[model samples]
Target chain A: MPVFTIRTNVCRDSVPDTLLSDLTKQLAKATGKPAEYIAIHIVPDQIMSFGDSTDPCAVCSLCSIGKIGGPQNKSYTKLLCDILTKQLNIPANRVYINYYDLNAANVGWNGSTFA
Target chain B: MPVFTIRTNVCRDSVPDTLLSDLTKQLAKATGKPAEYIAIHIVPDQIMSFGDSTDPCAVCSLCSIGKIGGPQNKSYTKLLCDILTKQLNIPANRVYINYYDLNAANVGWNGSTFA
Candidate 1:
């Protein structure tokens, strides 16, 4: 499961309808992961500042068991930056994302870890 | 890049207005990172369920390149949980946070990777 969490300065009521679904589909396609297992949290109206500026910025994190890290993560960043810009008007430079190639043992589900 | 993101059921803070700044200070202290590199996202008024009850719960995520994991992470957790409990009124047990140990190659900033 890959979880993408976004904290943006966008207003709550102004967020577009298909943003979450769009990211989900894009992530599923990029990682070849099932949509049912992917989770996205778009948190709006956050108190934030980036690069000495606060205009329409966001910080994102994507953690999964695999398919992220190193040079591959640049593509993931671009993918998210594209979506955020399209949906929230946040620029690519204003957005920062960290990709984590997590381990199953650290991600718990049901009664036990995903491992 | 020490970032702490929180999603809580609190719509507004009747508590102190300095909660985010407080968190930044504590995180900076714990990680020995500067306040400039630390980002704190407190996304309140989320629709969530923990233990079958809403009752002031929060899910948090912290990401950074180092000064995390093993015996050192608990300090961060304890400091944050205390703040969440006291400020948001979310009990210690009602909070769940995931820590990601990331790499510079996977963390993008200023139009390029930190690597």
Candidate 2:
């Protein structure tokens, strides 16, 4: 399971519904997972700032089982940053993405751990 | 600093403003951190399923610097699950919480990382 969550200072109404759907598709492709197994969350108009300024910026958190680290993560980072830059008009430099490689036992799904 | 984020399939309008504020306060107390240093995000009406069902379920992700694992985490889990159960009417069994012990250097805030 791969969950892509985006938290930005941009207003919620500003993001189009199509962008969220397209991002979900792109994330599924980037992670080599099915779209049905992926989850995306976008929180806009949050009380947050980057570089000490409230300018448009985003914090992305990506959590998944296995499929993290090494070369593939770098590629995913580039892909995600590009998506944010193009969609939100936020510069890549202003964004920070955190990747969590979770253990199956630590992640609970359907009332049980993936482990 | 701690961030408590809730992602659920429940509708957004179903959640009240008071619940978010109360949860934030409870999180600050549970994590032994200031409320000002905490960030809370509630993503409702998400496309998600657990146990292969589209029922009312929640997935909470808690990320913080140093304050994870051991007894505190277990306590936090209980507290958070209870919050979800009471606030969203989702059973504690259906709620899954993932905690991330982040390195200050890896988490960026205010144009730079906590590191």
Candidate 3:
């Protein structure tokens, strides 16, 4: 009964329905588990900033989501999980996805702050 | 102390444990933070897809889980976050609940592919 959280960033508005459905199916297929077994989540766009270094960028939001990537796939930081490999043009080993547990209203995303 | 990740895609199968323990004591009595600061992660499935650019929809899993939803409750991302809503939709938001921080045998829900 192990639970995991998968985090990813996207610059989209709502995320296509087919994509969501397909994602769920793919995850189940990959893990050999039922669709209900996986817990998928999507993050919205934000102002990502990184300092001068080989390190990955950090995201800042108004609420508490979760933690960032560990050591292995840090470069994939702020990008969507599926697109990270292509987005960064980095090898699969260099990519990393972080997790953040967040609630809705608390995010303050009303086209002004979260927008 | 600000983090967020919300994404969604589900059809339904496994989420039934008094609905994950009454969904963790009603998510720590709603809003005040409890049950160990809402560190919930239950992502196992691994197959999601989207298409044709409606803006939203994106998920990919392998080892790391975390990140999604920061732009207005990303679409009730995963599914079982205690039936979403502050009442007829908790807190009245986009129903975005996303977060991923995996650390369970490297997500080996090995039924062959997280089954």
Candidate 4:
């Protein structure tokens, strides 16, 4: 079977513990699946920035809102999958998110430059 | 375009620095691409072990041979792609390599037992 990797970046208010719990509950209820089977991770706002090599160097709203700060952090990959379906209303088949961690040194900004 | 993710564990001696340089040269020649375009990473043998929960707890021969130990180490992804085509004669278009770093705790074996 093909594995679907779904990654998303959203606004901070979009995710909270209560929000996560509600989202989890809704997802499980909608899918008729157990909540335990769902893997969910929350990234805090700090510790993420976008200005490595792209442009602007702003903290990536995606990382901050979706809660993907720091290396080696993980949560429910399924939550990402579910959120796309519910909130964005995109079809499940069309979305995938692959996770990658680049060292700060390997990350750069300014149009093809890496910090 | 479809993104091909190729991951393989090979014997380490098959991938020393000289081997990497040579392989890089051959691949660059074959594809008419710059050697810098390729990405290669070598893993050491000692840090990798198998059977965390699967069958027998043994170091993965694939990881050990290919030298995939520890976390966050990289060399050349292209070397892996080239070695596949040159040594194994696999078609260039048929192979791909994606890099990943997993915490030891997330690596699991023995039918889904993650240690």
Candidate 5:
């Protein structure tokens, strides 16, 4: 599973629905995973800030099994930052995307483990 | 604090409200944490698949501070997978749960952090 979650100080209504869909598609493409297996979670209006400034900043987390690495994460950071800038008007410098690589056994599904 | 987030292809309307509350409570029990400190987020109507099939599936994340490890994670996986299968009709074999053991310094809350 490849899941991307966005937590931001921006209000949920401020981000367009279409942009969310576009970002989902982009994440699917970037991860080489089927769009059907990619999930996005957006948490808005959070009481958060970056560099001690509460101006439209965000912290994103990308968690996946077996498909995250240095090069991929770097590219994803750029891609996600661009999306945040375009959709939320947040500067790239104010956003942080964390990548988590999970083991199959660590992820459970359906009534069992991915392992 | 423990935060349990559910990302599923199931529609939002399909799941009842009480089940969410039940889950939040169960999570609190499993983690030995207070229910009020547990945050549960649900993402429904997602386009997702597992094992290359477009069937009912979910990926859950249990993020917490200073309270995750061998026994805790194993118990959490079982508890979460069972909840999904019971609440959403997803097969136990088709669900995945991931655990994130975060540093208190890394988790922000109430204008600062748990640290």
Candidate 6:
């Protein structure tokens, strides 16, 4: 399972309805996981700043069991920023993507921890 | 770079305006990092659940360079939840905190990645 959360200074009303569906498909292909198991959180209109300017910057954190990190993260990070760039219009340089290999014990789902 | 993000189903309008400022000061004490370096993202009104119920549960991911992991995470995690509880009224058990050690090469700032 992958929990991907994106927070941006962009406006919530500006986001399209199909954006999440599109992300689900993109992340499913990237992680080799089913769309149902992937969780994406998009928080817009957040009070955030980047490069000393708030001009549509974003930050994304993706937590997964595996299938990330090392040299492989280069492609993963690029893919994420690419998607955001296309969908949110947030430039890659103004974005930060954090990839994490989360432990099962720390993950909770359906009212229970993974481990 | 300690980026602390909290996503919950709680209504955004209900969240107090002072919540983020409160978090900023708390995180600064916990990580010993300057308040300016601590980035807190609170994305309320999210489509999230816990114990199979769409209640006031939250997930926090803290990305820091060091001063995390092992027993130290316990305090850091507790500190986060405690603040969320007092400020956001999100119970401690309902919160899931993920701690990560981010490298300079992977962290971006001022339109470029560190290192």
As a TM-score, model 5 comes out at: 0.66
Best by lDDT: 1
Residue-level lDDT of model 5, residues A20-86, one tens digit each, is 5676678888888866566566667789978999899999899888679989999999999988999
Question: Of the pair 1 and 4, which is ahead by lDDT?
Answer: 1
What is model 4's DockQ versus the real complex? 0.02
TM-score, structure 3 vs. true = 0.31
Model 3: lDDT equals 0.33
User: Which lDDT values do the candidates have, in the order given?
Assistant: 0.80, 0.78, 0.33, 0.33, 0.78, 0.78
All models, RMSD in angstroms: 4.5, 6.1, 16.0, 18.6, 5.2, 5.9
lDDT of 5 by residue, B1-102 (tens): 888887777888878787769988898888889999898888877645554455677777788885777666777777887777778777776566787778
Rank order (by DockQ, best first): 1, 5, 2, 6, 3, 4
Model 3 chain A scores worst on lDDT over the 10 consecutive residues at: A106-115
| Clash tally for model 1 | 0
- Candidate 2 interface RMSD after superposing interface residues: 5.2
Q: What is candidate 2's CAPRI-style docking category based on DockQ? A: incorrect
User: What's the TM-score of every candidate structure?
Assistant: 0.70, 0.63, 0.31, 0.24, 0.66, 0.62
iRMSD of all candidate structures:
2.9, 5.2, 11.6, 13.5, 4.7, 4.4
Interface C-alpha root-mean-square deviation of candidate 6: 4.4
TM-score-superior candidate, 5 or 6: 5
Model 2: runs farther than 4 Å from truth? B1-5, B9-57, B62-96, B99-115
Winner by DockQ: 1
Model 1, B22-82: lDDT tens digits are 8877887888887777767767767998999978888998888888878777888898899
The sequence of per-residue lDDT tens digits that candidate 2 reaches over residues A1-115 is 7777788998877776566577777877788876665666677878998989999999988888878988878999899998888887878998999998887555644444554
Model 1: per-residue Cα lDDT over A1-115, one tens digit each? 8999988877887688988898999999988899999999988877765533446788887889998767778777777777888888887777778778889999998899988
DockQ for each of the predicted structures, in order? 0.32, 0.18, 0.05, 0.02, 0.30, 0.18
Chain A TM-scores in order:
0.94, 0.93, 0.39, 0.30, 0.94, 0.92
